Design a binder for this molecule. Structure first.
Ligand SMILES: NS(=O)(=O)c1ccc(C(=O)NCCCCNCS)cc1
Ligand SMILES: [Hg+2]
Ligand SMILES: [Zn+2]
Length: 256
């Protein structure tokens, strides 16, 4: 599977039937139809004792992995019940600034979108979490083009080393707090993974406030390769899945 005409999102259903399920992601967030929910508690993002380990190019994006063998960088509060451990984070971006985010706000697409992945600790491990309806919590954050995001340059500078599919490199002491916007106001709804196996186990928390990154910083994302070393070069761009039908679901807001 991939993002090409012949193996892109419109073909995924052939191997992963759930692609046409009842709670798939991403989706369009209709701000006026969203319901401000007063019962929603505050989001509690605790990244102070976080430990990054490696950065890897998996052929569809690059993942910064974290040591989740202890509660070090966790997510809780908001719509969640229980603690979720941060396992990794990746992005989805476009070939042009006007596209790239998976989720959209009133049909508006951003240049990229960050996914901080967390799994519910009551299920023992990531593999067990994906066998549960409330197994994962992904914190989504939109990227717009403007000023440079300082907390992003360490990531951007390492991309030279992970150009092709399969490469990785040590990436310790990275602080994910530098990728968070000032506000934690969010939209929340029950969805899925946006890439196969597309399992429906995610409680999506998409933040209202976007972060800014320079034009220079996004380009470097576009220099990565989908292919491995010694194969025709395919620039890793447009690695995003379009909005899916909302169906019998309502998006709730933490603000008004
Ligand atoms: N895009 S996202 O943040 O929603 C997202 C987050 C995590 C994964 C992930 O871990 N996929 C690997 C599936 C392993 C489970 N074995 C099932 S067959 C995918 C998408
Ligand atoms: Hg699930
Ligand atoms: Zn993702």
């Amino acid at each position: 599977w991939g993002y090409g005409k012949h193996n892109g999102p419109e073909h995924w259903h052939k191997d992963f039937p759930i692609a046409k399920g009842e709670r798939q992601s991403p989706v369009d967030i209709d701000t006026h139809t969203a319901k401000y929910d007063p019962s929603l508690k505050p989001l509690s993002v605790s990244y102070d004792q976080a430990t990054s380990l490696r950065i890897l190019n998996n052929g569809h994006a690059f993942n910064v992995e974290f040591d989740d063998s202890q509660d070090k960088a966790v997510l809780k509060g908001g719509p969640l019940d229980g603690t979720y451990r941060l396992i990794q984070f990746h992005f989805h971006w476009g070939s042009l600034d006007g596209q790239g985010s998976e989720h959209t706000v009133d049909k508006k697409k951003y240049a990229a979108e960050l996914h901080l992945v967390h799994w519910n600790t009551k299920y023992g491990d990531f593999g067990k979490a994906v066998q549960q309806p409330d197994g994962l919590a992904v914190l989504g954050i939109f990227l717009k083009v403007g000023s440079a995001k300082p907390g992003l340059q360490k990531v951007v500078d390492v991309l030279d080393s992970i150009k092709t599919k399969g490469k990785s490199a040590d990436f310790t002491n990275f602080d994910p707090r530098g990728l968070l916007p000032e506000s934690l106001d969010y939209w929340t709804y029950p969805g899925s993974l946006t890439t196969p196996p597309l399992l429906e186990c995610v409680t999506w928390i998409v933040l209202k406030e976007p972060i800014s990154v320079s034009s220079e910083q996004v380009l470097k994302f576009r220099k990565l390769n989908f292919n491995g070393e010694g194969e025709p070069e395919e620039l890793m761009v447009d690695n995003w899945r379009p909005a899916q039908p909302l169906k019998n679901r309502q998006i709730k807001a933490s603000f008004k």
